[PDB]
């Protein structure tokens, strides 16, 4: 769909806002294992901390 037109019927919101970041999650086993392993690290053994 058009990038705007998302919020209610009006893009004006997005006009007021300076920096709009659309975030995307696509599944890439390399990257997905990266993020996952990172979280496993996050919980404990606190190795990340």
């Amino acid at each position: 769909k058009s990038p705007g037109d998302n919020i209610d019927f009006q893009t004006t919101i997005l006009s007021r806002f300076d920096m709009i970041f659309i975030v995307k999650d696509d599944h890439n086993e390399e990257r997905d294992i990266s993020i996952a392993n990172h979280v496993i690290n996050i919980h404990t053994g606190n190795a990340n901390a």
Binding site: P3, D18, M19, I20, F21, I22
Partner: peptide, 14 residues
């Protein structure tokens, strides 16, 4: 800054 905001424009495009 120009290029950072350019990434924002790329976000405006999609």
């Amino acid at each position: 800054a120009i290029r950072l905001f350019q990434a924002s424009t790329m976000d405006a495009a999609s």
